């Protein structure tokens, strides 16, 4: 026989409540009942009511297990999760939907919410997008499970309740590589480092292929050394940020004391209203504090608190700088301007900012 | 406490992934006390013991990765080695396997059982749901565990295949799309289902320069993020009018604020309302969503429907983080979608060939410039493709664009044409 | 002795009109009689009427020693010059405007006009800012004055009148050095080169010096010969920007076939209502056509009759097309989109963007 | 027909150079058989028929510019030579030489005169008024009369200095503000020669990476283009209110549609008219000059006045056409102007250690970066810089702003510090 290769995914379409795959791609309209419970209604007549809860998105498996029973429960044996990890039940009685509620928060302690309505302009935060952190990643700077139960603790009430004028995406990648969604987020989080590299060159003439390792480098800091079969960093060229170290375990730059993370806002991803943005940098830096990162927490607060404070109905937060410019952003914000946040990153092309990175055009 | 640092994070309304460690470790310990055949009982609190150990030096316990992975795939493995694995041994070895997900995260509870089932003989009890891609992540197991765990999945009543990692296509995923959502333009599901089946070997056995991530939004609204996170962003979109429901529209009229909230906050004024008609100027509708979005029982896409396809989107490294730009204004997704898989083998062929080492597909065509890329796919220069004309004259010419003149033949005689 | 040097222009104070001398900055309004004629009343009640004309730029002294006849006929011996090459007159007495008006096309043949109203709305074309072209310069792709008096002849009827309903500028570089204001008009025309050069090596040697030429390349398509001592053109690099050429008289791309204009379009200066912006080619090449010019003089009439055609009070052409779009745009002044036009002019860096090239911020 | 080319353009309405150049060797030839002091006659001639070539020919008929000035200054003359210089002998050498104009370009009769009988003795009697950068342009003449020439201009009645080229301070030029303009924010053309008297030795002897040029307009209409063609453009600015004149815009709006031609028109809705009162709040205006170019009778510039400073203008070559970006959000324009001197200096100081051969200073600031850039003028980073922080996380941080670390030792027992 040999083993099975190559047989991918189960098919999804097995995989739906009876409801969902009759009435597939026959949707009439979806209507936000309370935070966390979205009805969906059929053009059949068929009611489905969607009930969303936030999740660690590190699960047991004896968690998914529970989650397992409670589905067989209440949904007829079928889930799903979101694309921000939140998870959902499917329920065709609405006299159950609050017996399911409760006894996921009691069974698994995951509270319902993360939805917001377009429809009245009230919106939850919902689920912060991400990484391994300290778990699992050999390149980080930052943690990223326990900022992120840091940061939800402190704004618990903004996902279980419709509380913003408008949606609020926070993420957090724990390096540069920013794995996730980090780039394009109303708040990002993301780890730094602040200090160069040590060419460790022993490890580098075992283990380091050094012309890949050289181009990997964005400002052209490094250099072979060929006299020695290693590799010289011009560290008035090095920014940290840890791409070399990717690519070479012979150039280490963590520093404990000095790595941290930087705040972003204002990027979008949605078309609606406005097109598409990168999030900028508002904070430079900020230090790793294990566990409760009171300092970062304080901040990314500090900022949502401000624009919540300031901002209409569906003007997420570059919508509302868009309006009342940078200069009121970092008054209202408490924040300072340094020469940090001054764009430097050279090898971009000014090309790209004429490209049309968005799907808004006429036919 | 053997960890008062993650103790901390037990506290707190919201839920803790130091519980969701604990309960893990204490369970498996539990079964393998119980005589349950788990291979690697210890594997969790091992977890969490080194975790604390980085709550107090600040730093990774994890060192730089040897490569691993399954009978017959150079994918879907990363590895990953405890520095403190004489320390803790349970973790000196500790991959994760990552798992592809079906579409849009359906599941049923027999499928999430047998991953329970597996999982608990294999590796260390933890999971991710998601990974950020969109695969199911197996957290942590022994490179013994890897192929005989593989072969578990297999072999499951419902089975799941490892999914991507290295330069090969990772996973792609999909929103919901119309397994529940009335703004669905395509098939988001069915077309990442079937991307991920057709191009399962590329996926498996990485052979390109870099990455390449594919996403599928089923409108606009982008619920993926596709145009971030994905190389190939395969947007819906819709070519006619919107639907417009009049009754509706007054219903919504009776409490809704249309014109604040509606009129004045489309983009390209596209949308008028006189308290009793609503009028749409479809020509000058960029198909932003936020009117349909505001009055979903009132206004739908348009019939005529496909998707607008956006390269390039990546994070930073090496040239700058990319939110992906219009490829391809319009292309039709339908079954067995012959022209999104002829413009993605016509990429992935000259990527190959002409990529550097590294070098991600947005990089590249900023290398060779939008010409030779449109050239490649075989389509035309379209104004949709930039948000404004060049803002210098420093163009270039094809040879056969100039008039023919005595000095094209002096070009010529010398070899410079 | 020696001769007197570092003396510098003479003083401006000492050769102002009487009028304008007494009444230096302390003017109350300025209020434009009609096309051509700006009246100027001081805060101590005095009344100074501007008058002014179009000038070729070029000038015979003989034409400058007539302008200084009608200059102690109308304005007591003093006139000024504009920053788009313009002469205006200082008339106290208004009767005699329209004499002046008269006598100036009796002698020099200058139209009154060039003037324009923010206040009614109603703009004219005023001159156009051009370089040498033929009559000096050693690097050209097209002639200035040439096309500027073949341009001016057609459009001749925007000038004395005010037909347009916001600020057109017209500007012209002979090649892509890119003299005057010509990244920043609202209609632009820069010669062009679409032919690489052919390297003489004989005058290399002996004129160039080889390494900053090889550095001058703005796209690297310059490489060293080892052997030799010359310089080869890699053709795949090239885009014909002519400034190799500058650097070394042994590198020329002249094509009397393949040189044109490219039409830019777009640009603005003034900070009021929108940012300032750069220009944006439209039409990649239109022929050199002496004596007329007709194909260049086409498109820019086209271009220009098109936005004037549609655009509404103060909105100047750039304006038009934050209204528009690029789509719109092109389909009304009928003109075809290709590959030339997506930028690829690789090393600019994207952080410019991010810069504010603006005097319009708040305090 | 000498000229079947050059004669079909002294047709037509607006008036024609050709008959401008026909007109002055007519008038050269006809003085100097007339015993008039006259060394080039054949100038415009020798002009007009390689002129006619060119038509016939589609380009240009001059060479490259061997060096050639005058004694004691390095700039100021432009050279060149005709390649029909034989067939055409009187364009052998036919080199231009930049005049200094009065700021404004502002003028007596008399002043104008005697630069007329200069030029019409040692040149060709064709001139330029004006130059792009401002200068006058004496058009045509050879090696061994530019001395001579120069020696007259300098001892003229009302003498002229020449203007700058080559690497060195360009000609300063600065719109007519206090002389005609309402809305002037400082003495424009006092500024102007201020600074060119100031820095003469600059401005005549290059010593310099490449050119520096400098342009002062008197309000944010910006009617010298200060901010494209300059590298260093001061733009007049106010700090307070702007002045309103509440009688004066009843009258405007007796008649003006205030609201849709200004109302709605201010970028930041700074601007309210009720019909009985206009209300700006200076908060939110970034002063466009819009509202105050509308009613120029209601509407001034407020009290307290001095200028932007945008650095950088300048054409493409070689890293891309630059609008100037904020340096200074503001400084005081009053005599001696020691507060923009110190700038210039510093700026120039680091400028000609620090830049590449034919580097603008534009360019050195995008190679060493903002922080630098204001460390040489002394000034602290302002959110007014930009029109947005920066899209990436790869900053550079000060090696003082580091905390103290097991880290920062190492490097420092390195030497890497
Ligand atoms: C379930 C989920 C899709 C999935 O396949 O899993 C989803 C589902 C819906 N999205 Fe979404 N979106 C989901 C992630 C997203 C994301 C992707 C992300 O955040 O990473 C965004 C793009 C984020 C961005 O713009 O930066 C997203 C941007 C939207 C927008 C835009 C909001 C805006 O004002 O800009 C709409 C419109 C709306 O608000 O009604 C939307 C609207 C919707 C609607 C109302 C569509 C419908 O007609 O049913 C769905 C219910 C959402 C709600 O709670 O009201 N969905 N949606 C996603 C769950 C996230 C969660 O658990 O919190
Ligand atoms: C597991 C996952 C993070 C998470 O927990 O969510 C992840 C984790 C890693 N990513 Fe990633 N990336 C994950 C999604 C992403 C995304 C977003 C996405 O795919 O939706 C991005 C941004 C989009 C993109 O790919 O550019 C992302 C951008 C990167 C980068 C930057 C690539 C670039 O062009 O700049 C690195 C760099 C590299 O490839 O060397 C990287 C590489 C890595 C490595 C392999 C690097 C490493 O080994 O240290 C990660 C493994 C850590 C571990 O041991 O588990 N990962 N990574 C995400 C994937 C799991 C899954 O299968 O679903
Ligand atoms: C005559 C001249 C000043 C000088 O010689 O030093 C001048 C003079 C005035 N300009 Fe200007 N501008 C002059 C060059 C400019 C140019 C600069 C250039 O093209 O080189 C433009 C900038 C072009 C651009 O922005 O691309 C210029 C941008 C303005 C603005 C902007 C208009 C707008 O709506 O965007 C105002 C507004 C207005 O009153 O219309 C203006 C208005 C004015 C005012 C009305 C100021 C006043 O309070 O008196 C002056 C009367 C001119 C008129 O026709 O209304 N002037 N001003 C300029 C020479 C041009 C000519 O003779 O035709
Ligand atoms: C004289 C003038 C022609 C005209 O009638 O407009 C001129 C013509 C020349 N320019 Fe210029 N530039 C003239 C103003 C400009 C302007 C506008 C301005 O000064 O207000 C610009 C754009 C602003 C700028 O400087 O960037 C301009 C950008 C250039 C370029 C590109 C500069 C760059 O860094 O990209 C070259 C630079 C070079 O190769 O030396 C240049 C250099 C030259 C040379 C020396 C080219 C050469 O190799 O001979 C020119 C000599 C032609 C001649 O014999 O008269 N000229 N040049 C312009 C000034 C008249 C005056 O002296 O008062
Ligand atoms: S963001 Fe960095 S640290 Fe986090 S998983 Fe990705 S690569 Fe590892
Ligand atoms: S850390 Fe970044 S900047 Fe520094 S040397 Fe390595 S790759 Fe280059
Ligand atoms: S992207 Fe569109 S189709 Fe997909 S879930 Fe979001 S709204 Fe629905
Ligand atoms: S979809 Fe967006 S652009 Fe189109 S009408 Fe609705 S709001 Fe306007
Ligand atoms: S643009 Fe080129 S050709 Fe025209 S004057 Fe300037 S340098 Fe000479
Ligand atoms: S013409 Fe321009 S691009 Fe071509 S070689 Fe010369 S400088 Fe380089
Ligand atoms: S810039 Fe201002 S002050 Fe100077 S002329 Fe123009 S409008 Fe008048
Ligand atoms: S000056 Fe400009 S921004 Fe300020 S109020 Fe007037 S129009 Fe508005
Ligand atoms: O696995 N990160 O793309």
Redesign the interface.
Same mark, same amino acid.
């Given at each position: 026989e040999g083993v099975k290769t190559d047989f991918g995914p189960p098919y999804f379409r097995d995989l739906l409540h009876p409801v969902i795959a009759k009435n597939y791609g026959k949707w009439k309209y979806h209507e936000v009942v309370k935070p966390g419970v979205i009805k969906r209604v059929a053009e059949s007549g068929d009611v489905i009511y969607v009930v969303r809860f936030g999740t660690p998105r590190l699960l047991s498996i004896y968690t998914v297990r529970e989650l397992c029973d409670i589905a067989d429960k209440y949904s007829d044996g079928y889930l799903r999760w979101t694309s921000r990890n939140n998870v959902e039940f499917f329920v065709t009685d609405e006299s159950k939907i609050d017996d399911l509620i409760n006894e996921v928060q009691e069974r698994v302690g995951f509270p319902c919410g993360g939805t917001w309505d377009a429809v009245k302009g009230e919106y939850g935060l919902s689920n912060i997008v991400h990484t391994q952190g300290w778990i699992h990643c050999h390149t980080p700077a930052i943690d990223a499970s326990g900022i992120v139960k840091a940061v939800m603790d402190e704004l618990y009430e903004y996902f279980t309740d419709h509380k913003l004028p408008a949606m609020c995406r926070i993420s957090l990648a724990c390096c540069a590589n920013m794995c996730g969604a980090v780039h394009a987020s109303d708040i990002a989080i993301v780890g730094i480092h602040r200090t160069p590299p040590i060419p460790n060159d022993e490890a580098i003439r075992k283990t380091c292929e050094i012309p890949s390792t050289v181009a990997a480098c964005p400002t052209g800091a490094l250099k072979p050394d060929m006299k020695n079969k290693t590799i010289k960093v011009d560290v008035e060229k090095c920014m940290y940020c840890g791409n070399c170290y990717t690519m070479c375990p012979g150039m280490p730059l963590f520093d404990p004391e000095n790595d941290g993370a930087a705040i972003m806002v204002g990027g979008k991803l949605s078309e609606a209203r406005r097109m598409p943005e990168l999030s900028k940098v508002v904070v430079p830096w900020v230090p790793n504090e294990p566990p409760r990162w009171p300092t970062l927490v304080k901040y990314v607060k500090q900022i949502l608190e401000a624009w919540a404070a300031n901002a209409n109905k569906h003007e997420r937060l570059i919508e509302w700088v868009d309006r009342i410019g940078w200069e009121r952003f970092f008054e209202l914000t408490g924040l300072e301007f340094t020469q940090h946040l001054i764009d430097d990153y050279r090898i971009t092309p000014y090309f790209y900012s004429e490209f049309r990175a968005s799907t808004q055009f006429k036919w | 406490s053997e960890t008062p640092?993650?103790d901390? +994070?037990e506290?707190?309304?919201?839920?803790?992934?130091?519980?969701?460690?604990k309960?893990?470790a204490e369970?498996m310990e539990k079964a393998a006390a119980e005589g349950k055949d788990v291979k690697m009982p210890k594997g969790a609190r091992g977890?969490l013991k080194q975790?604390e150990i980085?709550? #107090?030096? #600040?730093?990774?316990?994890?060192? @730089? /990765?040897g490569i691993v992975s399954v *009978?017959?795939?150079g994918g879907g493995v990363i590895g990953?080695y405890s520095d403190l694995g004489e320390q803790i041994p349970e973790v000196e070895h500790?991959h994760?396997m990552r798992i592809?997900?079906?579409?849009?995260?359906?599941?049923?509870? $027999?499928? %999430?059982?047998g991953?329970?089932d597996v999982?608990?003989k294999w590796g260390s /009890?933890?999971?991710?749901?998601?990974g950020?891609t969109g695969d199911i992540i197996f +957290? /942590?197991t022994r490179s013994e565990y890897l192929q005989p765990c593989?072969?578990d999945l297999?072999?499951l009543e419902?089975?799941?295949?490892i999914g991507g990692s290295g330069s090969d296509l990772r996973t792609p995923?999909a929103?919901?799309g119309?397994? +529940?959502?009335?703004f669905?333009c395509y098939?988001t599901?069915?077309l990442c289902?079937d991307l991920?089946?057709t191009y399962?070997?590329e996926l @498996?056995r990485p052979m390109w320069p870099y990455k390449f991530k594919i996403k599928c939004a089923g409108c606009?609204?982008?619920?993926?993020?596709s #145009?971030?996170?994905s190389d190939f962003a395969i947007?819906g979109?819709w070519?006619d009018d919107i639907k417009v429901d009049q009754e509706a529209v007054k219903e919504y009229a009776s409490w809704?604020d249309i014109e604040n909230?509606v009129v004045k906050?489309?983009?390209?004024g596209a949308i008028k309302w006189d308290g009793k008609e609503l009028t749409i100027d479809?020509?000058?509708?960029?198909?932003?969503?936020?009117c349909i979005?505001?009055?979903? $029982?009132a206004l739908k896409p348009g019939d005529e429907r496909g998707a607008?396809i %956006?390269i390039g989107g990546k994070?930073?490294? *090496?040239? /700058?983080?990319?939110?992906?730009? *219009?490829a391809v204004?319009f292309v039709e997704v339908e079954k067995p979608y012959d022209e999104i898989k002829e413009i993605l083998e016509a990429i992935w062929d000259w990527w190959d060939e002409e990529g550097?080492?590294?070098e991600r597909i947005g990089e590249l065509i900023?290398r060779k410039?939008?010409?030779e890329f449109?050239k490649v796919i075989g389509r035309e220069?379209? *104004?949709?493709?930039? $948000?404004?004309?060049?803002?210098?004259?420093?163009?270039?010419?094809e040879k056969d664009? %100039? $008039?023919?003149?005595?000095?094209?033949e002096?070009?010529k005689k010398?070899g410079?044409?």
């Open positions: - | 640092l993650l901390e +994070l506290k707190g309304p919201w839920p803790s992934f130091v519980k969701e460690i309960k893990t369970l977890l975790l980085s709550y #107090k030096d #600040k730093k990774t316990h994890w060192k @730089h /990765g *009978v017959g795939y990953r500790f994760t592809n997900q079906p579409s849009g995260w359906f599941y049923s509870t $027999k499928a %999430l059982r991953l329970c999982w608990e /009890g933890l999971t991710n749901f998601h950020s +957290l /942590g593989f072969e297999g072999n419902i089975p799941f295949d995923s929103c919901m119309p397994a +529940l959502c009335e669905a098939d599901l069915e289902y991920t089946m399962q070997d @498996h606009p609204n982008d619920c993926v993020a #145009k971030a996170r947007i979109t070519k809704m909230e906050l489309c983009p390209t479809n020509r000058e509708c960029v198909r932003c969503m936020h979005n505001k009055m979903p $029982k607008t %956006l994070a930073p490294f *090496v040239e /700058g983080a990319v939110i992906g730009w *219009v204004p550097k080492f590294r900023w410039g939008m010409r449109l220069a379209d *104004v949709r493709m930039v $948000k404004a004309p060049r803002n210098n004259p420093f163009m270039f010419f664009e %100039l $008039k023919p003149s005595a000095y094209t002096e070009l010398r410079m044409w």
